[PDB]
Structures are given as C-alpha cells and as structure tokens.
C-alpha cells in the first residue's frame, strides 16, 4: 500500500523508519456503568515488558499511566491485560477475552481467570460388569 516506510534525511544522509503513532489494538472491559466505574485494559499482540513504549506513556495524562504499569499485570496469548487481578481457580466464562481467559466481576473487583471446560469426573471400565437403571423421570 502506498504508505511511506523510510525517508532519507537531506542533511545527515541517514535513513529513518516512519511508523504510525499508535498501531495495534486496545480493548476496554467494563462491569457496566451502572455497576462500577472501574475498567480493565487489554493491549493486543503486545508483550507486556514494552507496553509503555508502544503507547507513548510519557505523553499521557496521569489517569492513563496507572493502566500502563502496576502490580495487576497479566500476560495472555491475546496480549497484556492491566487492571484485572489474576486468580488461580476456574469458573464458567462471563466476559470472553480470548485464548482461554475470561474475566468477571467477583468479590468487589474485576478478576481474570481461565475458563472451566466442565465438571471433572471418571467412570470405571471393567470387562465383566454393567450398569442398568432402576427408575426413570419424565
């Protein structure tokens, strides 16, 4: 596409890359305006060691710098999620983020967990036994 990538400086005769000011994707996760005013911010396809460089966090308001680096940083295969407290246990999916991670509003704060596939169970296999029902339901 006719979009200039590099340009030669006419004085020092070096080469400069030109890239867009903010390329990528940012997504906002809310519990609803009528529920709370806190959000969680997801940066897509961005390793979370250099999220401050790819957003130009030095030229932002101080209400954007608290969603750029903190103790609530999570790294998912979609990107970096900031503002959601990671929990180890798994529940059903509430807000689909992507690549196996969901987020929800639990006890209040926004938590981000791995979604649970289903109930964990097991049935034994033996070569000389069977299970036959005795009652029914309509």
């Amino acid at each position: 596409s006719d979009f200039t990538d590099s340009v030669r400086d006419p004085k020092t005769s070096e080469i400069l890359d030109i890239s867009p000011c903010s390329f990528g994707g940012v997504s906002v996760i809310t519990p609803g305006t009528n529920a709370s005013s806190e959000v969680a911010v997801l940066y897509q396809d961005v390793n979370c060691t250099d999220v401050s460089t790819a957003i130009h966090a030095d030229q932002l308001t101080p209400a954007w710098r608290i969603y750029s680096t903190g103790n609530n940083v999570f790294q998912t295969q979609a990107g970096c999620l900031i503002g959601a407290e990671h929990v180890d246990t798994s529940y059903e999916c509430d807000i689909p983020i992507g690549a196996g991670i969901c987020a929800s509003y639990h006890t209040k704060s926004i938590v981000a967990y791995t979604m649970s596939l289903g109930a964990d169970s097991s049935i034994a296999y033996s070569n000389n036994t069977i299970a036959i029902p005795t009652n029914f339901s309509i």
Partner: protein, 85 residues
C-alpha cells in the same frame, strides 16, 4: 464542580492577542485551552448539561467510542483519542 458557560458577546476587532493582564482596584486563576475531543449532551432547552473528555480515561475513551453515557457489560474495542501529535 461543573458549570457550563453561556456566550455573552463576540467582538469584531481584528488584532493579534498574545498577552493579557488583569486590572485590579481575592484571587484569579488562568488556564490555557488545548485542542481536544469532547462529547457534549444537549437537553430539550438546547443547553449543554453534560460532557465527557475523551482523552482522560480509558472509560471515557470507551464512552466516546460507543457515543453514549451508559455502557453495558462486556469487552469493547476503542479508537484512538489518547494521543495528539
């Protein structure tokens, strides 16, 4: 707090103004205007009764991207209102 300002008057005087100076006989505060993106709400009288600044919060950027003051639960994708050249 919050208070909208009504237009009293516009003067057809063609000069450059790069300095000013108050004239006293209390305190006064001076702030400078910058080019930003607002979202304003007009009631049935025709008056601005609410406004959100799209460059302040990720939530406010979301409110300006959806173009509403009420947001339902879910994940949304937002535009770029946070950086100006």
């Amino acid at each position: 707090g919050f208070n909208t300002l009504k237009p009293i008057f516009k003067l057809p005087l063609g000069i450059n103004i790069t300095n000013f100076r108050a004239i006293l006989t209390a305190a006064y505060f001076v702030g400078y205007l910058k080019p930003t993106t607002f979202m304003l709400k007009y009631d049935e009288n025709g008056t601005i009764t609410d406004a959100v600044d799209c460059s302040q919060n990720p939530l406010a950027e979301l409110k300006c991207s959806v173009k509403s003051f009420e947001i339902d639960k879910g994940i949304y994708q937002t535009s770029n209102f946070r950086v100006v050249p």
